[model samples]
Target: NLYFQGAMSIPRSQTTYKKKEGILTLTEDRKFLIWTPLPATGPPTVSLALDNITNLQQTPPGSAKVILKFTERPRPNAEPGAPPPQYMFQFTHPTDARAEANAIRDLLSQLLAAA
Candidate 1:
């Protein structure tokens, strides 16, 4: 399993947001868990099954956000030309940000190669 714990800024608005302590975990089987503690909101947690990931990219060398794109799974009545979903998560500290992104990129590369 790969794990990292630190403060993360979750966007709340275009000009405002909140920073909360959180941990991101990726299990050996490719299950991902992202959790943050926030008040009055349904659990600030996202669990992902990564087999659907179609693209993963990191920003410039010193950037903090890693962008991920995934092909949506087919649904019973889904439209044929719907766009894929994208997600961005930024690490609160630059030092860990680069390291984390590198590790994640490596893992993704391995997964893609096997597929």
Candidate 2:
């Protein structure tokens, strides 16, 4: 049930504490939809219906990258009905994601705790 979303640039670049170049976004329908904030705002800002998501990773300031996965159990039926008994949509950050290692570690630790 684990999925990933592509890496996106933040509202501004993360240079200094004041303003850094990073990528961060929020999803309206966290249970069925995802969104990535882009620098430019206009027509091309929105990337509708991600065909296939992958490469769930991220790079340093030089080259930042992240992968996303759009999946469904048994079969993905993007229809108007009840949930698929699982998280239809979700977002994630890589290990070196957005200079937030501690947070990621905490999340991973919690996930592994079940094991």
Candidate 3:
């Protein structure tokens, strides 16, 4: 299991977003899971299959958000020109953000190559 200290969220609208706090985990099967106790209807979970991930990047040095570009757009009925679905992560501590992003990127690279 690979875990990191961070928060995760998805965009709620062009101007809003909801965030959750938890230890992000990389399961043995290459799944990204956020373990949080937020009152989710079913489970306080957020996940993505590593294979579905198209990109992993950190923008603007010192920024708190780590952007994860995904191949599958989460919203099927989005506008024809809508941007692709992406997940955003922010480390609990700003100092940890870059390292966490790098670690995840490295792991994703290995998983994709082995596939």
Give the number of the best model, judged by lDDT.
3
Give lDDT tens digits, candidate 1, residues 1-115. Answer: 9755322332221110134434444543554423344442455465455665666665776433543333434545668787655545554433455566556556656655555
Residue 69's lDDT within candidate 1 is: 30
Q: Give the backbone clash total of model 1.
A: 0
Clashes of 2: 12
- Score candidate 3 by TM-score against the native: 0.57
lDDT of 3 by residue, 82-111 (tens): 877776655544455556656665666666
For candidate 2, lDDT tens digit of each residue in 1-115? 9966434322221111113222323233211122333342422222322222221222324443322222333236656675432221112343444444333323323333432
Per-model RMSD to reference: 8.3, 12.5, 8.6
Provide the TM-score for each candidate, comma-separated.
Answer: 0.56, 0.24, 0.57
Model 2 RMSD in Å is 12.5
Task: Provide the overall lDDT of each model, using Cα atoms, as 2-decimal numbers.
Answer: 0.47, 0.30, 0.51
**lDDT score, residue 112, model 1?**
55
